[PDB]
Structures are given as C-alpha cells and as structure tokens.
Design a protein around this ligand. Structure first.
Ligand SMILES: CCCc1nc2c(C)cc(-c3nc4ccccc4n3C)cc2n1Cc1ccc(-c2ccccc2C(=O)O)cc1
Lengths: 261, 11
C-alpha cells in the first residue's frame, strides 16, 4: 500500500537526521541569513584562508585545501556507511555486494549532499563555520582550480528542484541500491530493494511537491549526471596522483578509488 | 580486499 511506502520514507528520514549532522535545512538557514547564530567566516583569498585557520605550514595552499577535502570525504564515507546500514534489506546483502555498492555509491552521494551546502557563490565548510567562495576555488593553480567547478555547476541546477531533506533521504538510498555497479555478485535482491525505494521516492515527491510535475523524472535524470561528475572527478584525481609530490591519499579513499570507473 | 570498508560494514 501507499502506507508501507510512507513508513519507509519516514524511516529513511529519521536515520538520515541521525547519520548526517549538517542537514540541508540548517545549511539553508545559515546561507539565507535566517538563523540567529553567527554568520560563517568567509574564505576568499589566501589571507582570509590563513585567518580562517585560527578562527576554525610546510605545504602549499592548493594542497592544504586538497587535504582538507580528504579529511571531510573520509568522515562523509563513514556517515554514508552508517545511513546505508539502516536501509531495509541492505545488511542482509552479500557483504561483498554491500562493499561494492558503497564503493561506487559514496561519491555520487557526496556530490548530491554537497549541493545542499552550496550556492552559486560558494560552499559551506567545517559544518557551517566557514564559507569558501567559488571564485577562490576557481583561482587555485591547475589542476586544483577546476576540481570544484563541476560540483558547483551541478549544484546550481540540482538546487533548483528545491528538494528537502525528507526527499533527499530517499534519493540517496536509491542511488546506493543501483543494480548496475560493476562486479555485483547478486543483482536481484538489490533491484528488489531499489524498486521499493523508487516507489517510495515517487509517492514522496507527489505528496511533498504536489505542484511540481515530472519531478520524479527530473530527479532520475540527475542520478545519471552524477555519474559524469564522478568519472571526471576520478580522471582529475588520477592526474593529481601522477603529478604531485606527495599523493598522500588517505587509505579509506584508496580502498574506494582502487579499480574504479 | 577493502579492509576499512569491511570493518565499517560489520559493526
Ligand atoms: C569520492 C570520494 C570523495 C572525495 N575524495 C576527494 C579528494 C581526494 C579530493 C577532493 C578535492 N576537492 C578539491 C577542491 C579544490 C582543490 C582540491 C580539491 N580536492 C583534492 C575531493 C574529494 N572527494 C569529494 C569531495 C569533493 C569536494 C569537497 C569539498 C570541496 C570544497 C570545500 C568543501 C568540500 C566538502 O565537501 O567538505 C569534499 C569532498
């Protein structure tokens, strides 16, 4: 029934609130001027970056930023793994399939949720403590200065769909249970969970956005634009890995990127 | 092999 699908939707929503401390609702409070705690410290050039590091050496700026992204990617994988484990039926899957789904899903989810922390002018960092302008990220020396630009461009169009947290929670579940990841051993029970999640998603969108026609369809088209961000991103990272003194890639991220599309 | 991933999965 509709009701079983409502109940799945709510269950994913609560576990998303538990798993992810900075929700899209809070990011949007922060960014709009609403909320009544302090405005984020903004980082727009080298000097502001430096002063931001005492409010929020040895190495070059583009590399400091790179390595900061790694720290937050690592924690994001962790949060996403915990959310995955609350998706009904996920932990009954072959463990090797759980790993494959995370390995390919995590980046797609990361860039979906990054869009929550973004506007056309920059991005929240350190959990809403800071705001790092897009210009400044764009201004970094090659190849570092175009690392983020494709995330921003995706974010601006994705953000126009005006999804909320309750929507996003089912969307990210759907992405995680994609039956076409390379090397999956047993596709069937993954497509059966995903079938149920997609039905949950479609109900959710009709209920939550009754005025937004074909939002389900528009949102399916995004699950495959994400694919492109991911492949471009892996390509640019293979380049950095080749051309930069100390790759220094966190070993969680090395597990994820090894033998990846 | 994916050692970290396996440990975060079973927990
Ligand atoms: C798929 C596994 C996740 C992952 N691994 C990454 C590595 C190794 C580097 C960079 C990166 N971004 C860069 C941007 C510029 C220069 C170098 C950069 N580098 C190396 C980004 C990475 N991401 C996703 C990501 C993307 C963006 C962010 C992010 C980016 C900017 C600000 C905040 C965040 C964030 O999500 O905290 C966070 C996470």
């Amino acid at each position: 029934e509709s009701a079983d699908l409502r109940a799945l939707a709510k269950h994913l929503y609560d576990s998303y609130i538990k798993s992810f401390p900075l929700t899209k609702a809070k990011a949007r409070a922060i960014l709009t001027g609403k909320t009544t705690d302090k405005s984020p410290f903004v980082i727009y050039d080298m000097n502001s970056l430096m002063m931001g590091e005492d409010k929020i050496q040895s190495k070059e700026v583009a590399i400091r930023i790179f390595q900061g992204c790694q720290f937050r990617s690592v924690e994001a994988v962790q949060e996403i793994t915990e959310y995955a484990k609350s998706i009904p039926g996920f932990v009954n899957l072959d463990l090797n399939d759980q790993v494959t789904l995370l390995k390919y899903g995590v980046h797609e989810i990361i860039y979906t949720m990054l869009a929550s922390l973004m506007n056309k002018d920059g991005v929240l960092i350190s959990e809403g403590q800071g705001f790092m302008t897009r210009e400044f990220l764009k201004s970094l020396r090659k190849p570092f200065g175009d690392f983020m630009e494709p995330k921003f461009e995706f974010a601006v169009k994705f953000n126009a769909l005006e999804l909320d947290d309750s929507d996003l929670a089912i969307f990210i579940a759907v992405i995680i249970l994609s039956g076409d990841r390379p090397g999956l051993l047993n596709v069937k029970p993954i497509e059966d969970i995903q079938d149920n999640l997609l039905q949950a998603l479609e109900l959710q969108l009709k209920l939550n956005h009754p005025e937004s026609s074909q939002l389900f369809a528009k949102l399916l088209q995004k699950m495959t634009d994400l694919r492109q961000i991911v492949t471009e991103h892996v390509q640019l990272l293979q380049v950095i890995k080749k051309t930069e003194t100390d790759m220094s890639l966190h070993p969680l991220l090395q597990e994820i990127y090894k033998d990846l599309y | 092999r994916h050692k970290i991933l396996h440990r975060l999965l079973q927990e």
